Every structure is written in structure tokens, then in C-alpha cells.
Amino acid sequence: VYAWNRKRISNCVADYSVLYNSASFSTFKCYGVSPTKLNDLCFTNVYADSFVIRGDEVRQIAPGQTGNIADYNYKLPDDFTGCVIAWNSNNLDSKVGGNYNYLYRLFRKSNLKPFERDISTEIYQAGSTPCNGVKGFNCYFPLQSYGFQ
């Protein structure tokens, strides 16, 4: 989620009907546009932002939302015009021993702007003394692992 991928789609015919009837989606919410009207609309460009989060964090992906994911990993504008789709990936992103590959940003001085990606791994300074790239007391690694099982 902190390194959410983005794909730019342009100069193509977007078949939304087949797209929305392919898989079973546990969450499908659109804002500023209906799913069925997209077949009638044209746009300069499209952006597909893909990532993985917790189930309880899925609610944070929406306009006017706040939280660790919304503030420090992936932020949407209050006037967002587009759709959000989410589906459980337990059979894909979970391991018996725990899947720690997926990470999320935990500490950050300020909240992210909409559609801003932060991949910094600098030690977060939680106190007055500088950290100088050494993690310890009041010096925390900014990322935390999910460890899905």
C-alpha cells in the first residue's frame, strides 16, 4: 500500500461491463460516476492504482477518509471521481508461516496529499535527538509488515 502501483491507461476502448462481471468483488463503490455510465463516457486518461491492505482498512479507501492507510500510505481526494474495488486475497497473499512481504507506512510527520506515493525508508525521528539512520528509542523504522496468514 505504501508503494501502491499505478498504471496509466490511454488510447484504448475500456470495456467496463466485462470488467465488472469477471470476478466476485467484496467491495465496489463509485463516487461521482455510476458503474454503468462509464461505457458512455470518454476521458483523457485513466489511472489504475493497485495495492493490498487489511480488510478493516478497506473502509479507509474512500473520499474524506482518515487513518494510517489514508494519511500515510494512500490518500484519495474529497472530490474523487472514480471507483474503488476490493476483494479478499487470503488464498493469494497469505502464507502458513505468514506473508510479511506486504508492508505499510506507520510513522510520518504529515499526511499524504491525494494520489501521493511515499517510498521513503528513513528512520522516523520521534524525539528531539537526531536518529542519523540508526533505529532505537524514539527512532523507528517507518514501515510495518502485515504478516498475513
Epitope: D56, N68, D71, K109, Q144, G147
Partner: antibody, heavy 119, light 107 residues
Framework: EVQLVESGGGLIQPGGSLRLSCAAS????????MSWVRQAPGKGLEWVSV???????FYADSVKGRFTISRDNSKNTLYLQMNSLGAEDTAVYYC?????????????WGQGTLVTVSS | DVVMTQSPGTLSLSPGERATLSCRAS???????LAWYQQKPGQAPRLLIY???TRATGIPDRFSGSGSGTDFTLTISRLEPEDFAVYYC????????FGGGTKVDIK
């Protein structure tokens, strides 16, 4: 030398307002998750509210619409403004750094301050 | 939206014995999301264990934590009189959730 010194507790009439203050030393209030957790006399611990380093604030349902968490970076002090206080709000309030989540646990804790809501 | 229940309500064990406190979850909770805090009378809660197995800084080695899923255990080996306190298990699903606490009396 990390300390959290709390103040502002005492007696408040029902329906009145109050402000609890929490001066922090050894850590930066504006750069850390700061939570308020209350414990009623003889009962367990109840998380009241939290403020993130980025400024976002969250409150427990028992206090939504009545409590407001804030901070002063210049004074490095956390603040909790309580309004429309009732009998159930009588408790000892502690300020802590963190939110009780992985890598963000409540540590350290202040000595706490008692608030009594009675006529 | 996961409820934690602590047991037993009170515990009475002589010094030097092994004290076991249980924290059960209605749903499988990751071990990294559970922590144990200690609160002696007239004192603020102190972090004992985090991650359900990691001992907090400055905590005696006799305190240990284990378990996963729907059952977590806090073990106090070689119980001492100074261990008289209330132990709470806490976790985070959408907001901090604290357990009902467990009183540890010493005979």
C-alpha cells in the same frame, strides 16, 4: 528522562467542561501518536481518544461529540477538552504515546489525573 | 470487532509458583496485535509484553507471553510478592480494545 506529567483533573459539575493537559519530556508530542485512556474507579482500562502525528484525531464512541484531542508543539503538550461531562466520565485519565497497535503500543504512561463529576 | 476475555477474574498463588493468565479471542487475532500490560495499585499501567511474545524493556525475564489465534497466555514464573497487580491484554482491530483484567493475589 522520558516523562508524561498530567494536570487539570479535579471536581467538575455535571454538564460542565474541563481540559486535561499532559506535558511530555523526552519525546515530541507533534511527532508521535498520543492517546488518552481512562479508567473508572474500580473498573478496567478504556481507550478514550488518539491523535496522530499528522494531525488526524479519533475518539471512542462513548466520547464522540463531547471530547476533543489537541496538542501544542511549542509547549510540547497534549490536551483533552471534555464537554458535557456526566457521572460516567468520573475516572482517572492517562496520556500515553502510541495507539496499542503493532509497533505503536502505549509506552510510556503518565501518572494519571482524577476527574470527578458531581454536584 | 474482536472481543477479548481474560481469565481467571482473580488468581491466588503462593510466592515462587507459576502464574498463568489467559486471554481468549472470539476470532483468530494475529499474535503481533496482542500485548500485555501490568498495573500495580495506585500506579499507571506498564507495558509488560508486546507482540504477544516480546518482553518490554526493563521487564524481568520471569514474565513471558505466548499463544496465538484465539488463545494467548501470560506466564509469571517464580511469582514474587511485588508481582501483585492487575494484568490486561490489549489488541487493535479498528480501535484499541482492552481486556477485563486479571487480579493476581499472593497467598
Amino acid at each position: 528522562e522520558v516523562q508524561l506529567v498530567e494536570s487539570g483533573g479535579g471536581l467538575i459539575q455535571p454538564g460542565g467542561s474541563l481540559r486535561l493537559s499532559c506535558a511530555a519530556s523526552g519525546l515530541t508530542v507533534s511527532s508521535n501518536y498520543m492517546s488518552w485512556v481512562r479508567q473508572a474507579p474500580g473498573k478496567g482500562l478504556e481507550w478514550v481518544s488518539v491523535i496522530y502525528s499528522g494531525g488526524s484525531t479519533f475518539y471512542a464512541d462513548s466520547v464522540k461529540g463531547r471530547f476533543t484531542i489537541s496538542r501544542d508543539n511549542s509547549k510540547n503538550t497534549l490536551y483533552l477538552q471534555m464537554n458535557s461531562l456526566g457521572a460516567e466520565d468520573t475516572a482517572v485519565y492517562y496520556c500515553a504515546r502510541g495507539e496499542g497497535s503493532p509497533g505503536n503500543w502505549f509506552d510510556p504512561w503518565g501518572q494519571g489525573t482524577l476527574v470527578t463529576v458531581s454536584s | 470487532d474482536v472481543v477479548m476475555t481474560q481469565s481467571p477474574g482473580t488468581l491466588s498463588l503462593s510466592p515462587g509458583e507459576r502464574a498463568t493468565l489467559s486471554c481468549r479471542a472470539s476470532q483468530s487475532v494475529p499474535s503481533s496485535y496482542l500485548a500485555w500490560y501490568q498495573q500495580k495499585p495506585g500506579q499507571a499501567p506498564r507495558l509488560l509484553i508486546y507482540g504477544a511474545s516480546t518482553r518490554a524493556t526493563g521487564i524481568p525475564d520471569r514474565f513471558s507471553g505466548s499463544g496465538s489465534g484465539t488463545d494467548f497466555t501470560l506466564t509469571i514464573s517464580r511469582l514474587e510478592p511485588e508481582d501483585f497487580a492487575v494484568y490486561y491484554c490489549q489488541h487493535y482491530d479498528t480501535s484499541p480494545r482492552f481486556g477485563g483484567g486479571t487480579k493476581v493475589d499472593i497467598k
